[PDB]
Amino acid sequence: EKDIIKMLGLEKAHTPQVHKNIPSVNAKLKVVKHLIRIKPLKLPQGLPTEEDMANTCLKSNGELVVRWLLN
Amino acid sequence: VPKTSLGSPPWPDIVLPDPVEETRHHAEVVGQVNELIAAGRYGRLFAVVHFAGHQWKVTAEDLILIENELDVACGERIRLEKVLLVGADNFTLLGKPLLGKELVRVEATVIEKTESWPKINMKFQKRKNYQRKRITVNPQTVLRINSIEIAPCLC
Amino acid sequence: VKCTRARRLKKRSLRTLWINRITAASQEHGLKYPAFIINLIKCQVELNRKVLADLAIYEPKTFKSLAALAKRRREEGFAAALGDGKEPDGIFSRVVQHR
Amino acid sequence: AGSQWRLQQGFAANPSGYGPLTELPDWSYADGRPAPPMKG
Amino acid sequence: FKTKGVLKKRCRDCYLVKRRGRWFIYCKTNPKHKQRQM
Amino acid sequence: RKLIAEGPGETVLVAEEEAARVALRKLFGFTENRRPWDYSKP
Amino acid sequence: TYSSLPDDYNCKVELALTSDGRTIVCYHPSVDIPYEHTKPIPXXXXXXXXXXXXXXXXXXXXXXXXEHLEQGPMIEQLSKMFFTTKHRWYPRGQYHRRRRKPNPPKDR
Amino acid sequence: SSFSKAPQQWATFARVWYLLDGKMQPPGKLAAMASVKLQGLHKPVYHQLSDCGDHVVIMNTRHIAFSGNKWEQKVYSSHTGYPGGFRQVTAAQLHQKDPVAIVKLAIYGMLPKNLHRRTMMQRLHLFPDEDIPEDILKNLVEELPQPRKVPRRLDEYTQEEIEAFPRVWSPPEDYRL
Amino acid sequence: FREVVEILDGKTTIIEGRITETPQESPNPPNPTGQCPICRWNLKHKYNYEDVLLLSQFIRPHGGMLPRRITGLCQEEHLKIEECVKMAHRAGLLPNHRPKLPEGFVPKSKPRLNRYLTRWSPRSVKPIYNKGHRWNKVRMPVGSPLLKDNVSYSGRPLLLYH
Amino acid sequence: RNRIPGRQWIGKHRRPRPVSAQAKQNMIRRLETEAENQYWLSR
Ligand SMILES: [Mg+2]
Ligand SMILES: [Mg+2]
Ligand SMILES: [Mg+2]
Ligand SMILES: [Mg+2]
Ligand SMILES: [Zn+2]
Ligand SMILES: [Zn+2]
Structure with missing residues (x-):
């Protein structure tokens, strides 16, 4: 279990991390599912372009925001 | 449903x-206050200020000791920005969870850059x-709050 | 050693002292602690417990206003949940966003 | 406490995380010169 | 008397009575049927 | 019947004394609540 | 005409909210104490220490009071006065008196 | 707000004399608040190493109410220290002998266990009925709210409220009562 | 409510029935369709031992219970009412309904201890000398579990043991 | 005067300690989170 979690980069608690929703990974997640909290990412403004890289924030509802704090 | 000790929520x-x-009542109260501010009838302001990871209760002429080093020449005059609360004898202004910069301003001065006295951390x-014995010294910075200034504008 | 473990304890101690103070003044207004704190939060007012307790000692006025606020919001919450409809937002029940 | 309600509104669990509280540069020079940025 | 975990009416005239937070079996016809729940 | 000022004390005497202190302070304008002093460069 | 708490005491209290909505405000004037709720100042002064015959003898009669008790009994009365136990009222030892901070710090 | 220093501080830490009526109240729910007020935990200035604790006078002590059968099964024990000198006493008996005891033990057992308990035990005044030295009457500041709402017997209710409450069932006439 | 009357006259004895007026059920029940006298008045899981105005409606002048078949209560509410009646009594409420005995008011005993929410009889209970530590406790019973279905405005289930 | 034989939590005889309403809550809370988890892991 420990090493699943190690190779998930889930080392440090209460920290979000991102992963492919493919099955290869779901093997692992299925092994540890009681140790974790999974929630779907959501992209309301859509995906970050390069200009939006320094402005991108992640809200606890599981949502990504591209433009953070205009002027 | 007669009156029983239960049937009526206690x-x-x-x-x-x-x-x-x-x-209406609100616009009224706010206006009245804004007139107390336009007048300048508030004697002495305090404000609850978020700074450097902490919250402090600040009034003019005073002193706080910040636990970390800030890079400013000694003596520089500095506008603290994040302000949670403001207050005066008659009335009080509350940020959700902050005040508009234009609504209030607090200017403090850095007084002394310094090193903390030795603290002793000993595991056994x-x-x-x-x-294991360690002696730790922390860079410290003392600011004097100079002025709390409140501008007229509120709606 | 005892000095160090104490250094870590000291922060607990302070927080408890604080909380009890807050509690006390809250009581003076006929309001229990937890109700006060949460219903103060729900108004988007982040205040430390430190600064809270000092608002209860050195600022009885300001403080009484705070407890009134939270009281207002609480009852507004009782009616919010008892009303069972989406239309009313209490004037203080509204959730502001940053600009 | 109060993590729950904070969550349902969509704020951070902790008032320290990602709120405008932490984000803004809490001091300036009085002249208006924008302060040197913060390590956090 | 007797003290018992289990009462039973040992006859027709036996009856069942709760006194002093206990169960009793009292019998007029025979005294010997007297029982006391423990 | 308006209340001008009030004060605390160890005896009724010293109380009158201090409520008087207060009254005097509000009269003259020397009061904690007073605007803290100006420092500015005109 | 609504406040959550009675205006009986401290301040009359006005909560309000800015039409913007990003600011709460409070108007709290002090509520002073009603002349109805007051009772007259106690005035008691009576001097019978004056003997009609000689008044220097009589004005030396208010300086004529003083007394001596034992440690135990005095301590009892002392502790019945200020509502403390008999313990506070005993001396402290040499070592303990030695170490009381000679010049203690003062705020304000 | 503006006070001189000596008076200001004297005001902040000023002791208070509180009164609390015990007629028909659980000794527990009484001692709870009694203890609060004794430790000084109602005062926001409170601190442990600070002497603050407020006097408390409870009156009508004999008139305690005990929920459940507690009168019967709560026993108070103590020991002389002599062999076979051990004493178990029904609450009912104890209170019979000394009205004050019951409440005093509640409050005592309810404080922190350090020394100051002994001292705050001093500021606690306990009266079987309402008989109070006009000394202690004179200095009373304020009255505390009765911690339980006492149920009225049948005979308290105004006929207005007796009639106001609806007859639930209609009895048969033939039946005798 | 039929009073039975007896007369002793000149070595002859008259025993006869006489009917008094039975008050009638109030006009307008909230759940007219409802069955049991409690349940049509919306009173279920509401009345406690603290309601006299409800309770005194079923009992006898000398304080005992009514027969259920006469009151016709759902067996459950019958037992509930029973317990609450005993409780209210022990609670020294309904002082009216104590049986009248001209000699017995005179012989003072210590003023009756004020108690409430008392499930047992005061004579039966044995004093528990042994308490017991935190892992085996002897719980002093309060209220009756029959009432465990009364609505809790607190959401905290009523505490039956301490 | 009521004692526990041997060691508190260890042997064939143990200090009895009961489940708390609190405990019921915590457990349900975790179960909730994991029901949601094994949902998001489905598709
Ligand atoms: Mg790690
Ligand atoms: Mg740390
Ligand atoms: Mg052992
Ligand atoms: Mg074992
Ligand atoms: Zn038999
Ligand atoms: Zn029914």
Whole structure:
């Protein structure tokens, strides 16, 4: 279990991390599912372009925001 | 449903005025206050200020000791920005969860860059033969709050 | 050693002292602690417990206003959940966003 | 406490995380010169 | 008397009565049927 | 019947004394609540 | 005409909310104490220490009071006065008196 | 707000004399608040190493109410220290002998266990009925709210409220009562 | 409510029935369709031992219970009412309904201890000398579990043991 | 005067300690989170 979690980069608690929703990974997640909290990412403004890289924030509802704090 | 000790919920019932009446009453109260501010009839302000990871209760002429180093030449005059609360004898202004910069301003001065006195951090084990002694010194910075200034504008 | 473990304890101690103070003044207004704190939060007012307790000692006025606020919001919450409809937002029940 | 309600509104669990509280540069020079940025 | 975990009416005239937070079996016809729940 | 000022004390005497201190302070304008002093460069 | 708490005491209290909505405000004037709720100042002064015959003898009669008790009994009365136990009222030892901070710090 | 220093501080830490009526109240729910007020935990200035604790006078002590059968099964024990000198006493008996005891033990057992308990035990005044030295009457500041709402017997209710409450069932006339 | 009357006259004895007026059930029940006298008045899981105005409606002048078949209560509410009646009594409420005995008011005993929410009889209970530590406790019973279905405004289930 | 034989939590005889309403809550809370988890892991 420990090493699943190690190779998930889930080392440090209460920290979000991102992963492919493919099955290869779901093997692992299925092994540890009681140790974790999974929630779907959501992209309301859509995906970050390069200009939006320094402005991108992640809200606890599981949502990504591209433009953070205009002027 | 007669009156039984249960059938009646044991707590005073609630009435909140209609939102239009309250909207009027509010605009009113705010205005009155804004007139106290336009007048400058407030004697002495305090403000609850978020700074450097902490919250402090600040009034003019005073002193706080910040636990970390800030890079400013000694003596520089500095506008603290994040302000949670403001207050005066008659009345009080509350940020959700902050005040508009234009609504208030607080200018403080850095007084003394310094190093903290030695603190002693000692870990120890029973008969495992492990002592570790460390002496730590922390850079510290003392600011004097100079002025709390409140501008007229509120709606 | 005891000095160090104490250094870590000291912060607990302070927080408890604080909380009890807050509690006390809250009581003076006929309001228990937890109700006060949460219903103060729900108004988007982040205040430390430190600064809270000092608002209860050195600022009885300001403080009484705070407890009134939270009281207002609480009853507004009782009516919010008892009303069972989406239309009313209490004037203080509204959730502002940053600009 | 109060993590729950904070969550349902969509704020951070902790008032320290990602709120405008932490984000803004809490001091300036009085002249208006924008302060040197913060390590956090 | 007797003290018992289990009462039973040992006859027709036996009856069942709760006194002093206990169960009793009292019998007029025979004294010997007297029982006391423990 | 208006209340001008009030004060605390160890005896009724010293109380009158201090409520008087207060009254005097509000009269003259020397009061904690007073605007803290100006420092500015005109 | 609504406040959550009675205006009986401290301040009359006005909560309001800015039409913007990003600011709460409070108007709290002090509520002073009603002349109805007051009772007259106690005035008691009576001098019978004056003997009609000689008044220097009589004005030396208010300086004529003083007394001596034992440690135990005095301590009892002392502790019945200020509502403390008999313990506070015993001396402290040499070592303990030695170490009381000679020049203690002062705020304000 | 503006006070001189000596008076200001004297005001902040000023002791208070509180009164609390015990007629028909659980000794527990009484001692709860009694203890609060004794430790000084109602005062926001409170601190442990600070002497603050407020006097408390409870009156009508004999008139305690005990929920459940507690009168019967709560026993108070103590020991002389002599062999076979051990004493178990029904609450009912104890209170019979000394009205004050019951409440005093509640409050005592309810404080922190350090020394100051002994001292705050001093500021606690306990009266079987309402008989109070006009000394202690004179200095009373304020009255505390009765911690339980006492149920009225049948005979308290106004006929207005007796009639106001609806007859639930209609009895048969033939039946005798 | 039929009073039975007896007359002793000149070595002859008259025993006869006489009917008094039975008050009638109030006009308008909230759940007219409802069955049991409690349940049509919306009173279920509401009345406690603290309601006299409800309770005194079923009992006898000398304080005992009514027969259920006469009151016709759902067996459950019958037992509930029973317990609450005993409780209210022990609670020294309904002082009216104690049986009248001209000699017995005179012989003072210590003023009756004020108690409430008392499930047992005061004579039966044995004093528990042994308490017991935190892992085996002897719980002093309060209220009756029959009432465990009364609605809790607190959401905290009523505490039956301490 | 009521004692526990041997060691508190260890042997064939143990200090009895009961489940708390609190405990019921915590457990349900975790179960909730994991029901949601094994949902998001489905598709
Ligand atoms: Mg790690
Ligand atoms: Mg740390
Ligand atoms: Mg052992
Ligand atoms: Mg074992
Ligand atoms: Zn038999
Ligand atoms: Zn029914």
